[model samples]
Target: GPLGSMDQSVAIQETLVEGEYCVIAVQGVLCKGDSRQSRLLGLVRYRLENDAQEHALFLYTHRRMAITGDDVSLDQIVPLSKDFMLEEVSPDGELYILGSDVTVQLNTAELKLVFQLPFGSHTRTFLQEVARACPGFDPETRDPEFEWLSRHTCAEPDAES
Candidate 1:
């Protein structure tokens, strides 16, 4: 049975789980690119069964646009460590992370969707996830560049004496 029908808009949803816990919804667009141009957009939404607050994230990929009418597919969504270091705080008490130069909003009361742009520091986590997903990829015994990036971006902070 058709769950629903659409004229132009089409979407498919999937569940992203780390194991038996932390399941998230991944919704992606499905359409044929036209002559003018088309955008590849994604939306993720999730709410714990025990929690009432719902969290959502939106992604827009401008670089993936097709000019020659190509079929677009949703590839993969990688989840990174939620653990973040205290990068900085604004005079108004806003928190900022290492990845982006912009300050993250401390309050989430009025935010419609929460999204964070990827930075150099996020590469380690991305690579880690990729290794885990791919059978042949071994990130542990990688080249010097990987080691250097990991040390500089994702290494643990030195403890204060």
Candidate 2:
């Protein structure tokens, strides 16, 4: 008896990979038709630092890397100087309320985008992180939707509900 009694609520399926295991942190671009194995976008938050990790390939990274194309994808490396703009767009089930998707949209010289920035506090932090990373970026103009976002507070977690 290999001496093991597993107690998972459901047995895990067996065809998800080719490696031992993989953790995919969804970050940047890749909107519309995309998948875990093949990403159509690459957004990196480059920190002028000394170390980083697995996402060193994609996702929020901290290394000055190479990239091109689209307004949305460009700001993925934000502080594209203090000149870029990052705004929040909360959808509508009712006047942008009653809906449940929070997005962070960016605008640059030629490209623009929407990112999955959900939750109240998470939305707040994203703006500041970019502000800190690259000064001179703009947040001065206000959005009524963003104003609504400020009113939100993090509620109970999914695990609790």
Candidate 3:
């Protein structure tokens, strides 16, 4: 059955929405052709089964360096899901089987979605439910993992150059 649909104009319903998470932009240096530019690093933080799950965000910081399109930008900030492990229960009441790999992509507007996957139902819902089940996870934290990433890469110079 269709769970109703949302277009670009409708307000996001609070009831239908189960969780909210943040992707923090950290500082990473990248080189484009010959120019050095500071790029964004980040992590995805949310709760899974009332426990914290921090995903390391990855982005291709060199491809399409200057071109802009609806497609993901190489130089702009983005969130990658290459390393995220799902640890929540599914909408069907089963625990998340973390065998599958998921990829999240960010387009020109910073809009994001799962672009690749070890496909299954209710994975997204599971993530949201995990957020709902966890009371301690706060969006205001900006994710400690993101903060740690900033500190980890602070001393490194641009890798591309």
Candidate 4:
């Protein structure tokens, strides 16, 4: 046997507690469907060994993973494994991730996560770690790659009578 285990809750601790480079924990809201609910976006870095490493910006329902019945959201795992344009911040100060493909449903429509506060707050640390994990990536000097998304087709999606 390798390393054993401690009193790390009852459920499978391996699945819940695996963050080698640390995961930035911050509260955010999911602005999709009919609900603007609180969601957790884990700017995660896993499997940094060599073969089949992962870098995913995932979505979660709760922060404390040890809690029973708590888990990730339905829109889990925003695809950073492929192509992602995660450069500068949005005009509204929301940290948005650029979509995957152009032939999909919304067709490369953005999924923004908002953290509105007076001070830089958690976003400061989060951004720092993001840059720290990589290199030569600064939000200030980089030109804003994200433009204001399509507004006309938004309200129409949730027109409940």
Candidate 5:
């Protein structure tokens, strides 16, 4: 068995290293290549407190002028990959990373919930599901599970602003 546990549906990959396993949450940043609106782009990184594994992960992003744990003022600690698009800055200085279609949020209890396309499903199928879930999007009956998600997981831009 692995050191930690997750749903069987979530196939655990071996990409994780020992210390890196401390990261419990992640968000993707979308790239707006030419459009004014942002689209799916890069991955934003997050780490949970060693003692407070039960709490929300402390959000961290690669900043050009970020100070590292070593107390160095080097900019290299920040990931250089453009795929990780930096979105808005939080009031607490945490950077919000976003991507097209997928949105991840932390609940009041510090649980990381992900809103994303269906696994092993095509884009069209995913879009169809989204349309069914969102009100005024589809004519078909809405998915009750998705409706529940709308209540809890959907990102409220207004709440952030």
Candidate 6:
């Protein structure tokens, strides 16, 4: 019924809109059965802060994305604490593991895959480093599947660094 076409029906609700930011709630139909009419995926937020720079922050799943800036400061990006435990690295030097559940893998030529289970300050810092390795990499935008995995693996928030 909407502009986009899909096998199942879907709907979105605008929840919040503010300066350079907006939030939305989405629902999708899984099956025709009455018991599974609609499935709620929760809220998704987006921003255009930092001089109209684009960023998306998924409220329900805690995923984020943004374009990289040249003026980005490492201290501002990296957490103060260094508690992230390096678990392992792939033999190919492409994948990295932090703490017990976070995995960072090289994906496309420019992007790397990073997912975590309700990671801690250290893990966040670690991911920041991974992003920094790639020029113009934005840590905010993440893989949707990875976001889902992170949510399902660990739902607890880590302590502030």
Best prediction by TM-score: 4
Alpha carbon deviation, residue 138, candidate 6 (Å): 12
Off by over 4 Å in 3: 1-20, 32-38, 60-161
Question: Relative to the true structure, how large is the alpha-carbon lDDT of every model?
Answer: 0.28, 0.31, 0.33, 0.37, 0.26, 0.28
Candidate 6 residue lDDT tens string, 10-67: 1222222233222322322233435433223222223234532222222222112111
Q: Where in model 5 is the C-alpha error above 4 Å?
A: 1-23, 30-53, 64-100, 104-161
Off by over 4 Å in 4: 1-15, 18-21, 32-35, 48-53, 62-75, 81-83, 86-118, 132-161
The per-residue C-alpha lDDT of model 5 at residue 103 equals 39
lDDT of 2 by residue, 6-63 (tens): 2110111121113322222233333655642212222223222444211111222211
Give residue 52's lDDT in candidate 6 (0 to 100): 28
lDDT of 2: 0.31
Pairs clashing within candidate 4: none
**Model 1 stretches astray by more than 4 angstroms:** 1-4, 7-11, 14-35, 60-161
Q: Show how many residue pairs clash in every candidate, following the order shown.
A: 0, 3, 0, 0, 14, 4
**1-161, model 3: which lDDT tens digit per residue?**
33532110111111112363433222224435785563333233445675645443434232233212122222322332223233332335255433463333334234433233333343344244434332235544332244433422322244554
Alpha-carbon error at 41 in model 5, in Å?
14
* 2 against 6, candidate with superior TM-score: 2
lDDT of candidate 1?
0.28
Lowest summed lDDT window (length 10), candidate 1: 143-152
Residue 109 shift from truth in candidate 1, angstroms: 15
lDDT, residue 56, model 4: 42
Highest-lDDT candidate: 4
Q: Write one digit per residue (lDDT tens) for candidate 4, span 1-161.
A: 22332221222222345444335644444346686555443555555346544444444454444323244332344533113344333334334332220111111126544433113344455556645433335444322221211211211223232
Stretches of candidate 2 exceeding 4 Å from the true structure: 1-29, 33-76, 88-93, 97-100, 121-123, 134-161
